[PDB]
Motif scaffolding. Structure first.
Motif, PDB file in Angstrom:
ATOM      1  N   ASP A  35      21.601 -35.821 -41.740  1.00  0.00           N
ATOM      2  CA  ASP A  35      21.128 -34.630 -41.023  1.00  0.00           C
ATOM      3  C   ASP A  35      21.790 -34.427 -39.649  1.00  0.00           C
ATOM      4  OD1 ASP A  35      19.685 -36.284 -39.197  1.00  0.00           O
ATOM      5  OD2 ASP A  35      17.719 -35.776 -40.125  1.00  0.00           O
ATOM      6  N   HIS A  36      22.847 -35.206 -39.326  1.00  0.00           N
ATOM      7  CA  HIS A  36      23.715 -34.921 -38.189  1.00  0.00           C
ATOM      8  C   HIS A  36      24.793 -33.881 -38.541  1.00  0.00           C
ATOM      9  CE1 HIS A  36      21.584 -37.870 -36.016  1.00  0.00           C
ATOM     10  NE2 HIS A  36      22.545 -38.741 -35.753  1.00  0.00           N
ATOM     11  N   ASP A  42      26.145 -30.224 -40.960  1.00  0.00           N
ATOM     12  CA  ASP A  42      25.928 -29.031 -41.791  1.00  0.00           C
ATOM     13  C   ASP A  42      26.930 -29.086 -42.955  1.00  0.00           C
ATOM     14  OD1 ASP A  42      23.915 -27.442 -40.392  1.00  0.00           O
ATOM     15  OD2 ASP A  42      25.397 -26.896 -38.876  1.00  0.00           O
ATOM     16  N   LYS A  72      26.832 -31.334 -36.107  1.00  0.00           N
ATOM     17  CA  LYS A  72      26.009 -30.312 -35.448  1.00  0.00           C
ATOM     18  C   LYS A  72      26.110 -30.350 -33.921  1.00  0.00           C
ATOM     19  CE  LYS A  72      21.867 -30.064 -37.616  1.00  0.00           C
ATOM     20  NZ  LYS A  72      20.783 -30.701 -38.487  1.00  0.00           N
TER      21      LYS A  72
END
Length: 339
Positions: A30-31, A33, A52
């Protein structure tokens, strides 16, 4: 020269320090895209992603643990990551982060936007001898580096050579690379590039990479590979015969180099004699090559790929876009403990 010997001694010291103590768990999913799927296979995919916080672009290779187990690729996948985090050379793609979660393994690499050599070769038909020789010299230096670290590469083919913003090569895909002092036995590689001793199920060595370099140089300068046939069993028959027909447009120097790399008897094959790589570097076909200037990236490339910026995907093709799912239960934890 002593300068080359001391360069390779330092290269091996730096490799071994990272090999003995590998980096682990240096990012998380989730760091980033997700942007686009760049290519897909049996147990994995490569996706363009953007970090991100920094905005940098990367190529993220994603492997499904359950599929890696079922296709008998555990050891190969552990080899890939442990070697990539330890190497450093101008013509190898750079690993920037790695991590795992309940479902997948991730290797986050620098993104090379110019596309695979394979696309550019098939577009133009064939490369002139000077253009083929510029790329071949980079592969010779990269194999000299890898073999001095006791690494065999085992996956040379035009799809695995990416073209960068300066028109130089970066080799990708270490899924079959392995650290080997002596012989190894696994059947792996694409059929048109396999050495005879792999087809015949022998214990083989680093000489298979120099055979594959002969196939690559032939395909770059002709437009098609030397043992071409419709089905693998027919390709293998041609390889083990080792009869090769050369186009008349090939120079006499090119033919002579290729007879010595495509030598069926591995004990007579260039790259595998007493003088090692120097039989290749000193061959007449390479007489115009300035080896130091190639390493230093000081030679003007024959071709600069067309692209608009570090996020452009126009030199890669289109695939169905699938989810990156992560189970709430951990899968295959034991098998991948060291990753």
């Amino acid at each position: 020269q002593e300068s080359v010997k001391e360069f390779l001694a330092k290269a091996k010291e730096e490799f071994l320090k990272k090999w003995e103590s590998p980096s682990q768990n240096t990012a998380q999913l989730d760091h980033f895209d997700r942007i686009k799927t760049l290519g897909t296979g049996s147990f994995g995919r490569v996706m363009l992603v953007k970090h991100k916080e920094t905005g940098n672009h990367y190529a993220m290779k994603i492997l499904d643990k359950q599929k890696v187990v079922k296709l008998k690729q555990i050891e190969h996948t552990l080899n890939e990551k442990r070697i990539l985090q330890a190497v450093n050379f101008p013509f190898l793609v750079k690993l920037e982060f790695s991590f795992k979660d309940n479902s997948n393994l991730y290797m986050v690499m620098e993104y090379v936007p110019g596309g695979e050599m394979f696309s550019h070769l098939r577009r133009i038909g064939r490369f002139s001898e000077p253009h083929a020789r510029f790329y071949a010299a980079q592969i010779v230096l990269t194999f000299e580096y890898l073999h001095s670290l006791d690494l065999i590469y085992r996956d040379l083919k035009p799809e695995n050579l990416l073209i960068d913003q300066q028109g130089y090569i970066q080799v990708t895909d270490f899924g079959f690379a392995k650290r080997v002092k002596g012989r190894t036995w696994t059947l792996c590689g694409t059929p048109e590039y396999l050495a005879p001793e792999i087809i015949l199920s022998k214990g083989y060595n680093k000489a298979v990479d120099w055979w594959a370099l002969g196939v690559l140089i032939y395909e770059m300068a002709a437009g098609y590979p030397p043992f071409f046939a419709d089905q693998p069993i027919q390709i293998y028959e041609k390889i083990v015969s080792g009869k090769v027909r050369f186009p008349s447009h090939f120079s006499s120097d090119l033919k002579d180099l290729l007879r010595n790399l495509l030598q069926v008897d591995l004990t007579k094959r260039f790259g595998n004699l007493k003088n090692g790589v120097n039989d290749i570097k000193n061959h007449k076909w390479f007489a115009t090559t300035d080896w130091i200037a190639i390493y230093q990236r000081k030679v003007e490339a024959p071709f600069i790929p067309k692209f608009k910026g570090p996020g452009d995907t126009s030199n890669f093709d289109d695939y169905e876009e699938e989810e990156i799912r992560v189970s709430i239960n951990e899968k295959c934890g034991k098998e991948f403990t060291e990753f």
